[PDB]
Amino acid sequence: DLYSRYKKLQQELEFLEVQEEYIKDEQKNLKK
Amino acid sequence: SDVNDDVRRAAVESLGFILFRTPEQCPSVVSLLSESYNPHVRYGAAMALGICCAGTGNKEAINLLEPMTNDPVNYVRQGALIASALI
Amino acid sequence: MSEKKQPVDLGLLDAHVWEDNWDDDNVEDDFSNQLRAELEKHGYKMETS
Amino acid sequence: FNVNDNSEYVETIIAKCIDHYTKQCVENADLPEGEKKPIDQRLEGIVNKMFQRCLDDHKYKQAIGIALETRRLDVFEKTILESNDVPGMLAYSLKLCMSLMQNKQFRNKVLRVLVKIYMNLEKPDFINVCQCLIFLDDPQAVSDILEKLVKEDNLLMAYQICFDLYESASQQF
Amino acid sequence: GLRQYYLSKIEELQLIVNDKSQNLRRLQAQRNE
Amino acid sequence: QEPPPPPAPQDVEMKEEAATGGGSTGEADGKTAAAAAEHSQRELDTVTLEDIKVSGKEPRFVLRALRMLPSTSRRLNHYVLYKAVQGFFTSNNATRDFLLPFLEEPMDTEADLQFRPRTGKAASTPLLPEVEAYLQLLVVIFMMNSKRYKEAQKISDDLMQKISTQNRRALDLVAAKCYYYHARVYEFLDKLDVVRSFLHARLRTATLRHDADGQATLLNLLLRNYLHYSLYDQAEKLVSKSVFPEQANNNEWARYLYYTGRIKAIQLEYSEARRTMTNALRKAPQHTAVGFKQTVHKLLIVVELLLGEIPDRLQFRQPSLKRSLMPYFLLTQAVRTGNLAKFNQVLDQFGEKFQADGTYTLIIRLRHNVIKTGVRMISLSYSRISLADIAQKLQLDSPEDAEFIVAKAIRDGVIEASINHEKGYVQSKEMIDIYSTREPQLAFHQRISFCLDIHNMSVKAMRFPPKSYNKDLESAEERREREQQDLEFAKEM
Secondary structure (H helix, E strand, C coil): CHHHHHHHHHHHHHHHHHHHHHHHHHHHHCCC | CCCCHHHHHHHHHCHHHHCCCCCCCCHHHHHHHCCCCCHHHHHHHHHHHHHHCCCCCCHHHHHHHHHHHHCCCHHHHHHHHHHHHHC | CCCCCCCCCCCCCCCCCCCCCCCCHHHHHHCCCCCCCHHHHHHHHHCCC | CHHHCCCHHHHHHHHHHHHHHHHHHHHHCCCCCCCCCCCCHHHHHHHHHHHHHHHHCCCHHHHHHHHHHCCCHHHHHHCCCCCCCHHHHHHHHHHHHCCCCCCHHHHHHHHHHHHHHHCCCCCCCHHHHHHHCCCCCCHHHHHHHHHHHHHCCCHHHHHHHHHHHHCCCCCCC | CHHHHHHHHHHHHHHHHHHHHHHHHHHHHHHHC | CCCCCCHHHHHHHHHHCHHHHHHHHHHHHCCCCCCCHHHHHHHHHHHHHHHCCCCCHHHHHHCCCCCCHHHHHHHHHHHHHHHHHHHHCCCCCCCCCCCCHHHHHHHCCCCCCCCHHHHHHHHHHHHHHHHHHHHCCCCHHHHHHHHHHHHHHHHHHHHCCCCCCCHHHHHHCCHHHHHHHHHHHHHHHCCCHHHHHHHHHHHHHCCCCCCCCCCCHHHHHHHHHHHHCCCCCCCCCCCCCCCCCCCCCCHHHHHHHHHHHHHHHCCCCCHHHHHHHHHHHCCCCCCCCCHHHHHHHHHHHHHHHCCCCCCCCCCCCCCCCCCCCHHHHHHHHHHHHCCHHHHHHHHHHHHHHHHHHCCHHHHCCHHHHHHHHHHHHHHHHCCEEEHHHHCCCCCCCCCCHHHHHHHHHHHCCCCCCEECCCCCEEECCCCCCCCCCCHHHHHHHHHHHHHHHHHHHHHHCCCCCCCCCCCCCCCCCHHHHHHHHHHHHHHHC
């Protein structure tokens, strides 16, 4: 079913976004 | 970033409840955090991982939990042993 | 890397070994072919007036 | 032009058409009470023509998706009472809804539509609506269904549905 | 048609995911070390 | 020595394309379909080499099956089994050829799992380049059919799902170069028209699914064939959206700039043509080919003889280009002195050459800019000068029209002076102290921005080598145990 695939991909995108933000924050805090 | 350890452990460990409807996800995020320097976070990671996928035989969880069993700081060994046994 | 394939073509294929080191093109252009006899340019100018 | 069906031009413009339509719908759904600025019905025309094209190809699952994508529930409803093997597709639709929805208002709209179709089958199946009634709560309704089963003297299935109820419902419910 | 349009959505979205994974790997290295 | 031909070339081809395909198939599509850039460069290398690189290679190559993994292994094996066959027997294809062997070979030889891009690449390389190059314009008629078959593969590229499913690889290259070669054929010995209609259509189908190199090669080719004739040629650039930046091979940017430079120069827009075409020239490589470097230099010289300058007394002697620029030097040597006599004596002498160059009309209007250059140098010499001398020393007999030529020169910005019509003197204003203004700050800010951009791109891009080939390490496990036992022993004491 094409629909389920579409939705899976859609959500995946967001999860990637949040992971990128978190690792950016970590990279900034370890210097201190 | 927070400045007191028990806040850090409870903050990490809570993630074991938000995701438990999609067990595939937790190892994708905690697997990095389990290499933190200060052990409180590592303990929290072990419990988050054990509690996300409690009932299953999920393989990658055990794959990550195995090398913790020799962590020098005794209480994270206690955490990893419990988690290993819940899953 | 440096493909330089070119529909545009080479196009074409001396008695000029007198390389004066560099340039002189503007210099040779300045006195292209005239005002030659500078000795005479002075001399036949001091008698003029 | 619409019926040419055989050019990149029309394909692109219909793509952007249905995109803008579903954009405007989801924007203007969700209760802008008093604003409610409506769609131009020509969009509705040209999109429902595509709905029809999907039905002609006997290709139902695309319709069942796009319907709830644009929040239009009636075309959704009709595309269950369809030549498909309805009682099989119905479970797929439910299992979709149970895991890819967030707006509780809209999710309850959908669930409230679907519930009564299980009450319309040649033999209705009560267990699905019973559990639907504890994904959104109406204890009086399940008590009434119970008494209906008692009057029809179908007591065995009443017992089975009671057991199914206790294991999952809230103590307060 | 939905076969062409509805697949066009998937194929247009699929590039961004690859690019994001690309970036994330590098940043994870940089933090681990 | 006859053995050496087969012995060496076969060895070189059994690794220059076997490894090429083996890497492309597994790294471009096996891995995330963005890193066929190494395969791209491989294709550039193979294109250049094959141009300078065959009957037996084609029969072998063609005999690749790719039905299955074991079949692909058998295909690489047959690559050498056919080498042994050639060593013992003969080659089915003779002096390349295999004119009808290829068409039948496409259907046959268990092509069960051959990848679309690999098939396209093999077809393009063997049939099109070999046939056209060995042809010496002979296969051109047959090459037309072979490229039509390539166009059938390109009908698959248009719509076999390759338009999107393998679009990454299919349009990353192969297609990009294919269009180029297919166009060249037509130019080689044919017409150009339905080619341009096809090109318009193919540009349109790009710019929607994809926005890279499908908008670069096509733009250049299309503008090429427009300029082959002498049409309008401008109403297209304005809405073109420009050759896509952010990515280019920096090569195509060069000729795109050259084209827009020419179409700007012919429409009486001189001043800003020189800067853009000089920017074009500085982007060419260091390679020995002087194909279009001669062309762009020639055009640059001729536009700079307009306005009122001198071309540069260099770039006339350099070894690579000299014979070709000879008439242009001999021309400017006249124009500088400003004596129409010699200019006519040059034109009536080399007019055949100039009109052959396809630039005769530009230089046919040059006399007026001759007089303009003369008055400009005068303007730069003096500051306060009477009109009773400007015409006297420019051989102009009337001092009434000297007013007009000077005034026009002022209008378009050639010289900054004003005129006192009653008084009869011309004086030029002097504006200095550009350091105190705000413009140097702007010029510097632009470069600051560029440099920071470079740093971001560099640290952003190829710093990916942090790889999972080796991950992370750790320490020993018995060490701490031993140490603690020893310290507890010390404690007991």
